[PDB]
Design a protein around this ligand. Structure first.
Ligand SMILES: O=S(=O)(NCc1cccs1)c1ccccc1
Length: 283
């Protein structure tokens, strides 16, 4: 079926939970043996969210190459993304090592450091220009260059220096600051505006490594971001945009990381975002 009318048909019939459970039943199951080794317990935020072995990002280290991060490679859309958990106190150095080694331009953050009164990820970037951060375990230095605070999101320019070689690179930090503590946003308008700002920066484009996107577990809000982006790109590429099937795209992405889209409300919000976004692209 088309999307917008499949949408109203699920709303009128109140069957979002049944649609979402079908997706969960059909989703791929691949091994995640490296994630479960005992030496990696303090590298995982949640015991039930792990990268598959076949698609995990490897650190360029011979001691321990593990990070909770996955490469999502979308062949027809010609886009790639790295989805990862919010960094932990003992993985902030690994996080920036990955950004460096994978040649990423942008980092997309969809959570606040504290939500619901608890810490959802480490304070992994500097908050003042004159107070830079040094990660001694991976030999990197990170400096805040500039910060632009808007009503729904903040954009930061950061400098990452590889202290071994003295090479430097500019990284863009795109921080969506207004996702509600419970549920999903009422309108997708500010989320779409944010997505378009990431696109306009070059961070999603083939001349760079894959964008790094995270929330707390790296599957829920993060899944919504890449699912909406890929679906809108396919609608631009194909002769028949109404052939784009959001459930099929989601199942394809779940071949690369488990659990993408965590609730039926997140699934409904993803439909809403693609539907509204497709009108703005044209008119
Ligand atoms: O016809 S669509 O599948 N896509 C239209 C587009 C053409 C080019 C980019 S987007 C559609 C329309 C409205 C709501 C959902 C889906």
């Amino acid at each position: 079926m088309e999307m917008e009318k499949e949408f109203e048909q699920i709303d009128k019939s109140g069957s979002w939970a049944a649609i979402y459970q079908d997706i969960r039943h059909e989703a791929s199951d691949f091994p995640s043996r490296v994630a479960k080794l005992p030496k990696n317990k303090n590298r995982n935020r949640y015991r039930d969210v792990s990268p598959f072995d076949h698609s995990r990002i490897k650190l360029h280290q011979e001691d321990n190459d593990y990070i909770n991060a996955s490469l999502i490679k979308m062949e027809e859309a010609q886009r790639s993304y790295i989805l990862t958990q919010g960094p932990l106190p003992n993985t902030v150095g690994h996080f920036w090592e990955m950004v460096w080694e994978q040649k990423s331009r942008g980092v997309v953050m969809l959570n606040r450091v504290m939500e619901k009164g608890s810490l959802k990820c480490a304070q992994y970037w500097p908050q003042k220009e004159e107070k830079e951060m040094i990660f001694e375990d991976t030999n990197l230095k990170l400096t805040l260059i500039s910060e632009d605070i808007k009503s729904y999101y903040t954009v930061r320019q950061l400098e990452l220096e590889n202290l071994t070689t003295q090479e430097t690179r500019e990284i863009l930090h795109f921080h969506y600051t207004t996702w509600p503590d419970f549920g999903v946003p009422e309108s997708p308008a500010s989320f779409l505006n944010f997505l378009f700002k990431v696109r306009e920066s070059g961070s999603l484009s083939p001349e760079h490594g894959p964008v790094v996107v995270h929330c707390s577990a790296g599957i829920g809000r993060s899944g919504t971001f890449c699912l909406a982006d890929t679906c809108l790109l396919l609608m631009d590429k194909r002769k028949d945009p109404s052939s784009v099937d959001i459930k099929k795209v989601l199942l394809e992405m779940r071949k690369f990381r488990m659990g993408l889209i965590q609730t039926a409300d997140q699934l409904r919000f993803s439909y809403l975002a693609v539907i509204e976004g497709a009108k703005f692209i044209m008119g």
